Amino acid sequence: MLKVNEFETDTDLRGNINYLFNDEANVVYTYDGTESDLLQNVNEVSKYIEHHMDYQRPRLKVLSDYYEGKTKNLVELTRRKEEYMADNRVAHDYASYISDFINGYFLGNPIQYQDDDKDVLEAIEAFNDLNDVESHNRSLGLDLSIYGKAYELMIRNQDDETRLYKSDAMSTFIIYDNTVERNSIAGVRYLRTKPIDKTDEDEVFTVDLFTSHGVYRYLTNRTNGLKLTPRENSFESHSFERMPITEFSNNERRKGDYEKVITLIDLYDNAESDTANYMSDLNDAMLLIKGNLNLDPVEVRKQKEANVLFLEPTVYVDAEGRETEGSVDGGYIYKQYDVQGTEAYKDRLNSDIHMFTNTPNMKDDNFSGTQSGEAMKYKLFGLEQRTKTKEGLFTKGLRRRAKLLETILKNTRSIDANKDFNTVRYVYNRNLPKSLIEELKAYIDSGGKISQTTLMSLFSFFQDPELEVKKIEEDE
Amino acid sequence: MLKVNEFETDTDLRGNINYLFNDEANVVYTYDGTESDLLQNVNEVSKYIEHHMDYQRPRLKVLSDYYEGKTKNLVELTRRKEEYMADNRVAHDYASYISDFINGYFLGNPIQYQDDDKDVLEAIEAFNDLNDVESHNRSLGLDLSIYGKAYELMIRNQDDETRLYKSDAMSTFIIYDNTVERNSIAGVRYLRTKPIDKTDEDEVFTVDLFTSHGVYRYLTNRTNGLKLTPRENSFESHSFERMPITEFSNNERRKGDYEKVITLIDLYDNAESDTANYMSDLNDAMLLIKGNLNLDPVEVRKQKEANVLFLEPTVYVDAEGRETEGSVDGGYIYKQYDVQGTEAYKDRLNSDIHMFTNTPNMKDDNFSGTQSGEAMKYKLFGLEQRTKTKEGLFTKGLRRRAKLLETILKNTRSIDANKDFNTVRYVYNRNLPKSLIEELKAYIDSGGKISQTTLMSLFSFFQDPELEVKKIEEDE
Amino acid sequence: MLKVNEFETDTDLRGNINYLFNDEANVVYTYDGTESDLLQNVNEVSKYIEHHMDYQRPRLKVLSDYYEGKTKNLVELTRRKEEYMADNRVAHDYASYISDFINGYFLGNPIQYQDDDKDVLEAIEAFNDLNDVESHNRSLGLDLSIYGKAYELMIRNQDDETRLYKSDAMSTFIIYDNTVERNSIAGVRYLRTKPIDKTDEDEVFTVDLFTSHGVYRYLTNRTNGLKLTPRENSFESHSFERMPITEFSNNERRKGDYEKVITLIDLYDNAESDTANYMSDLNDAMLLIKGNLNLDPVEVRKQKEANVLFLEPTVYVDAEGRETEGSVDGGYIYKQYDVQGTEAYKDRLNSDIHMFTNTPNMKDDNFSGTQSGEAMKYKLFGLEQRTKTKEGLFTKGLRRRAKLLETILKNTRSIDANKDFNTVRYVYNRNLPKSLIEELKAYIDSGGKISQTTLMSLFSFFQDPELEVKKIEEDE
Q: What is the DSSP string of B378-416?
A: HHHHHHHHHHHHHHHHHHHHHHHHHHHHHHHHHTTTSS-
Q: Write the DSSP assignment of C58-89 as a string of letters.
A: HHHHHHHHHHTT--HHHH-S---S-SSS----
For residue A422, give every residue at least 6 positions away whose Cβ sits within 8 Å of its Cβ, in sequence order, or none: A399, A402, A403
Give CA C18 to chain center in angstroms.
18
> What's CA B170's distance to the chain center, in Å?
12
Q: Residue A96, Cβ neighbours under 10 Å: how many?
A: 21
Mutate to test the interface with B, among A93, A171, A222 (most CBs of B within 10 A): A93
| Mutation for testing the B interface, residue in C288, C334, C362 having most B CBs under 10 Å | C288
| C81/A366 CB distance under 8 A | no
The chains in contact with chain B, meaning 3 or more Cβ pairs closer than 8 Å, are A, C
Kind and range of the H or E run holding A262 = helix A262-283
Closest to C333 (Cβ–Cβ): which among B325, B331, B472?
B331
Neighbours of C182 (CB within 10 A): 13
Determine, for residues B445 and A450 on separate chains, whether the beta-carbon distance falls below 8 Å: no
Nearest to C131 by CA among C418, C379, C404: C404
Asked if residue C345 lies in contact with residue B274, where contact means CB atoms within 8 angstroms, the answer is no
- 3-class secondary structure, C185: strand
Resolution (A): 2.4
The residue ranges of DSSP E strands in C92-244, in sequence order, are 112-114, 149-156, 162-167, 172-177, 184-192, 204-210, 214-221, 229-237
> How far is the C-alpha of A106 from the C-alpha of A391, rounded, in Å?
8
Classify the C-alpha dihedral A98-A100-A104-A106 as positive or negative: positive
The SS3 assignment for A157 reads coil
In angstroms, the CA C97 to CA C391 distance is 21
Contacts of C81 in chain A (CB under 8 A): 307
Q: How many CB atoms lie within 10 A of CB C389?
A: 20
Q: How far is CA A84 from the centre of its chain?
A: 35
Is there a contact between B93 and C356 if contact means CB atoms under 8 Å apart? yes
Q: DSSP code of A396?
A: H
Report how far residue A88's alpha carbon sits from residue B394's, in angstroms, rounded to the nearest whole number. 38
Q: Tell me the torsion sign for CA atoms B220, B224, B228, B230.
A: negative
Phi-psi region of C182 (alpha: psi -120 to 50; beta: other; left: phi over 0): left
Residues of B in contact with C4 (CB under 8 A): 19, 58, 61-62
Indicate the SS3 state at residue B162.
strand
What radius of gyration do chain A's Cα atoms show?
Answer: 33
Cα four-point dihedral sign A107, A109, A115, A119: positive
Beta strands in A198-295 (DSSP E): 204-210, 214-221, 229-237, 245-249, 286-291
**Cβ contact B356–A96 (<8 Å):** yes
Residue to test with chain B: of A75, A98, A166, A377, most B Cβ within 10 A: A75
Query: Phi, psi at residue A189, to the nearest 5°?
Result: -120, 125
Q: What are phi and psi of B273, to 5 degrees?
A: -65, -25
Set of chain C residues whose Cβ sits within 8 Å of the Cβ of A366: 374-375
| Rounded (to 5) percent helix, strand, coil in chain B | 45, 20, 35
DSSP B28: P
Nearest residue, CB atoms, B305 vs list C84, C317, C393: C84
> Which residue among C82, C374, C375 sits closest to A307, beta carbon to beta carbon?
C82
Q: What angle do CA A336, A341, A345 make, to 5 degrees?
A: 125
Cβ <8 Å between B433 and C6: no
Interface with chain B: mutation pick from A197, A325, A332, highest number of B CBs within 10 Å: A325
Alpha-carbon distances of C292 from A252, B289, C299, C309, C329, rounded to whole Å? 88, 16, 15, 15, 10
Nearest chain A CA: its distance from B164 CA (Å):
26
Structure obtained using: cryo-EM
Q: Do A433 and B27 touch (CB under 8 A)?
A: no
Closest of B91, B76, B68, B14 to residue B271, by C-alpha: B91
Give CA–CA dist C255/C261, Å, rounded.
Answer: 11
Contacts of C374 in chain A (CB under 8 A): 366
Question: Cα(A398)–Cα(A17) distance, rounded to whole angstroms?
Answer: 34
Which one of A88, A132, A360 has the shortest CB-CB distance to B378? A360
Pair type for strands B30-31 and B172-177: parallel
Beta bridge partners of A248: A150
Residues in A touching C375 (Cβ below 8 Å): 366
Residue closest to C170 by CA, chosen among C47, C65, C58 = C58
Residue B289 in contact with residue B92, Cβ under 8 Å? no
Return the closest-CA partner of residue C348 out of B375, B350, B267.
B350
- Check residue C326 and report its DSSP letter: P
DSSP character at residue B332 = E
d(CA C347, CA C268): 10
Find, among C328, C150, C392, C159, the residue nearest to C247 by Cα. Answer: C150
Q: Tell me the CA distances in angstroms from A185 to A39, A177, A363, one per residue in order.
A: 10, 6, 50
Residue B423, amino acid: T
